[PDB]
Design a protein around this ligand. Sequence first.
Ligand SMILES: [Zn+2]
Ligand SMILES: [Zn+2]
Ligand SMILES: [Zn+2]
Lengths: 111, 161, 196, 208, 175, 64, 48, 227, 56
Amino acid sequence: SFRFCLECNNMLYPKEDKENQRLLYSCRNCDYTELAEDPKVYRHELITNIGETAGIVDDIGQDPTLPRSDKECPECHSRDCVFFQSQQRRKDTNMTLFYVCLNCKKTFRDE
Amino acid sequence: DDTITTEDCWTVISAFFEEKGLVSQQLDSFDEFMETSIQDLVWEEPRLILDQPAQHDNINKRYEIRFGKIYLSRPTMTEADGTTHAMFPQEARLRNLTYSSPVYLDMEKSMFTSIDGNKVHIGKVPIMLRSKFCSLRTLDEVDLYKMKECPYDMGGYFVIN
Amino acid sequence: IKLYGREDKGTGRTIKATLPYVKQDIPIVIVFRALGVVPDGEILQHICYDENDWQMLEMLKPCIEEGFVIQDKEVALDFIGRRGSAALGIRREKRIQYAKDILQKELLPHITQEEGFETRKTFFLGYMVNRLLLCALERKDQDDRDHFGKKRLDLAGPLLANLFRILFRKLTREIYRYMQRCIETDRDFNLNLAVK
Amino acid sequence: HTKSVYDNGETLDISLPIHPKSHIPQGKQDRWVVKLPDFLDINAEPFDPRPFEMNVKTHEDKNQELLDKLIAVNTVRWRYAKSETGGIFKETNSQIIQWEDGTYSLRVGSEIFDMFTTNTDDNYLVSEHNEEGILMTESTLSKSVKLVPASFQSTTHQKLAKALSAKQKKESYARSVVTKEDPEERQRRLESQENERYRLERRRKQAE
Amino acid sequence: GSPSEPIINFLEEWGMEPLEDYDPAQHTKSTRIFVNGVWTGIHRDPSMLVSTMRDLRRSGAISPEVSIIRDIREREFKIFTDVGRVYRPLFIVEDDESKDNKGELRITKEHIRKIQQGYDDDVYGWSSLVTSGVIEYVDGEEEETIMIAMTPEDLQTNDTAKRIKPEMSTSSHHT
Amino acid sequence: IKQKLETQFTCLFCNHDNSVVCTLDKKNSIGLLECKKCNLSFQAPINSLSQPIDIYSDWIDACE
Amino acid sequence: QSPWLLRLELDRARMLDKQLTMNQVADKISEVFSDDLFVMWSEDNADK
Amino acid sequence: DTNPRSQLHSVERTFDEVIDPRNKNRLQSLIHPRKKIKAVKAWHFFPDTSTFDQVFHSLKFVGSASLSKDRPLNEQLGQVNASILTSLFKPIEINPHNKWISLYAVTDKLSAESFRKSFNSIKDDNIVNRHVIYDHIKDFDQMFRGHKKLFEDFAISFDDISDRAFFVPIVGRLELKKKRIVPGLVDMVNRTNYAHIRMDLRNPSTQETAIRDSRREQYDPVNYSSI
Amino acid sequence: TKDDFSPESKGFVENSYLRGLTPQEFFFHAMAGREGLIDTAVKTAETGYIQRRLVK
Ligand SMILES: [Zn+2]
Ligand SMILES: [Zn+2]
Ligand SMILES: [Zn+2]
């Protein structure tokens, strides 16, 4: 998540003040500049796990084509649950199941 | 209630085939084309406009013609001698004719002038057999034999030459 | 909407859109500003729907960096018009009008054709870019080409409609030519002779 | 620091005429913008039974007539009601009902239409002053409200369904006709006449 | 092929809100709505909308060949009135939990006897079955989102000659 | 790196066609249009996405 | 030297599987970049 | 029931079946057809007589032009603020191609509060000369969409003491977006708008009031018809 | 149901030809047979070209 100029709406780029030795975010079409809070200017993940469990919707229990199991919900302890494998579909994706209850909709595994 | 068996499924399938038939898609598509598609194709470009700023007294004359309704007719055969009569598919097959019907278009001509038309025949469209515009859609079972048409024939094809 | 740049190749992964009657590909930020959404925050709102999805944001960063040169609607329209494969030497005002013509019409015509109705086109561009990035990030399988639910069958209706449209356009052109030829005599043509 | 562009200080001494309001909002200058459905209409004019009865229109098209009947019976109206004490009062046929869940519903007669509210920010109502070319704000439009039929069994929904179902059933553009002669006869006879007058014109021009 | 204007009218009537009233930050959970491939609006309660559209199609108000698809995973609700889509009929199983007839075929012996007679008891053919809500057409894209039983015997839970039916033990229960 | 390209544009002073050559230097961000017959030189700034059509349009606007 | 810090986290599991040493990686980087980059590496007993 | 007599009879039947808001028992008798939930409160639905002469437009900010998004603007104008509730808009068009909107507001909270109280309490015929000075804040690009029908949109205002609900027509919708002024046109920009605008409150003239009454005579002729 | 890796859900015909195939097994077996026909009708031309090149 990156921020934008509050008066120009354009993207703010990181900058360093030579005299102050501080990190700043400065727009390019305007003189607006704001102090940087975090030092993590850039991050790149070679191996990532996002998109595995993030694929959750509140009304996934209304799908009739999804199998229904009897795994115990940690939160609601309901007798009815719906499970599915990982939404991320890379060639080396694990086959672990994600179980969703009909009340709390918490995603968990059998591991 | 009572359970549904396989024989009831076959009763339902029999109802399906009693209403639809086996070539219903061809006939339905052709009926849709003749009923509405031709008129919309004509109205896609409903105006031909010519203008002329005559100075030969600046007289700007605009000549515009508009396309109106589409009139269709039952297929008809026009002999060499001149007589025209209704045509049935068996005669077209025997005489190597084409089972087609004339198409008439209303053209309205306007002469706009600022100083500063009836059913014209545009062509003949072949008619799909047993469709809504075919002569065999009516005629029941008995007359179908007098016209030398097989009652088992299902239509869905054209007769060209 | 092509996504240039291979895995760890081609420097930035720029996105260039292809428009009808335009000779060369155009970066997506430029066409977005051409439709009339100049700030970058609004463009990101149009494309993405989850600010926490930093992966698609870092994928979009090179496109913004490339398109940063253009910062106004009119200049973007002029850039689109310059490559619009029209006559050479067209004036700037006529170039902008030609760009507006080629942008309102012929660009996603199935959505709309009337004026002042281009927000939907911007939203659909956002949807297309979202789908492209989503498949590029391997989050979804590429659309199946053999999926029979995405096919259509042309029966006698559509085929005859296409053929009749062609033939009727030919007849209309013949009538037009005959009218031009026969007005020189300034005669009351029967209009039953113009048709063939 | 984006310095202020305008520093001339030029000022206009324009005075606007304002009229007293028949009512004043209490506690909040909030209003709800509501989209008007096709099956619901607003008749701001006072209800005049005699012109209404004398101006009812009957059409051959059943769908159009049914739609007009539905919109007329569902139209919001008002009329002057003579009080039993001899005074005159404004009487309306429309009411707003709030249920126990807090939802709101627009009621016309026995018909009830639910309201779906979506919060909208930075949306305000203004009053236009065309003669001076300036816009004067009025209040804030906090929520956008959609009107939805309560249930399938509602008569309005059933009439709408009937009208829309039978509207798309009628489709027949081409009109049939009977050909009595050769369709090509006009072209050939007119071509013969044109060739005849071509020959006559050529002879005249050669003799002219 | 069918005109899409009635579909848009019904969608607007039943609470769909157009695109100009849409902000991605605000409606972070709303469902998009496509009609013939164009994004026309958004909706916040897609379940009741799809139920209403399906019931309207079954009652005959909407043309039975109109395709109604809900993609719960992608938060989309697509509608097709295009020409050239291949469909096929299927029986309808009463899947309403609130109904006593849950999990049973809607068609009963009364419909069968009406079909055999040829008329209703105050012409009764295939179209009457389709518009009475016991049979409906589905195309190749709507089939992605439905669960079909092979035979009416599949709707309820040692011979060397007869064939073997699938066990289907992966699912504790089926709807 | 200066890039020299032969273009089919029309000079507005000599009216000879196919006698226009576009010289753009990306290093200094400049573009020069020279008439092979008139010997006239037109200079205009260029950007990273500039193309000979851009400089030609700039010359057309400057001419009028 | 520049204030810009460039760091990267190595997967301990695969690093052990490939039978590699942090010193070896640092030496390879130093050899390919001479003295143009100052490099520090965490010990093998670090959590990451 | 296509008979005009039947339609009229339906109209009077609908008129007669209006539930008295004070009748608690009859209100509780009414039940939601689907929710099966009793009614709590009711309001009469009436049009507004004093406001039909004026023209109302729904004004909205699109995208980054949101006042909430503009943090320095909100801080300057106050974190409902009376300054927003008393803002002025000035549409100025140099040419068909170039168009924008000018926004003005009262920076002082006391002056804005006094003006808002005076404006919202206009029920008598005595108005104090409040020479309020409005300061320019920002300019936005504008687009307009018009309603084909008169009452396509209507805003609803409530009045609990009278148990009524007054609705007003909406003519069109105006959308505003943030506009970055070109550096080459600031010279003409400084000659377009103004740093301040002074508003003077005066009682409406008799002729203008008569014109407004004549305009309103279309809706309500019993209380406004000329004699 | 979705995400079903059971043998009968991915094309394992449990029955025999004498016993008869269920509709799902029938469709899967038809898919396999179609693949066989396509493979033959495609490889024949490639093999013919290869043999012609070898002979030449
Ligand atoms: Zn900026
Ligand atoms: Zn639970
Ligand atoms: Zn020259």
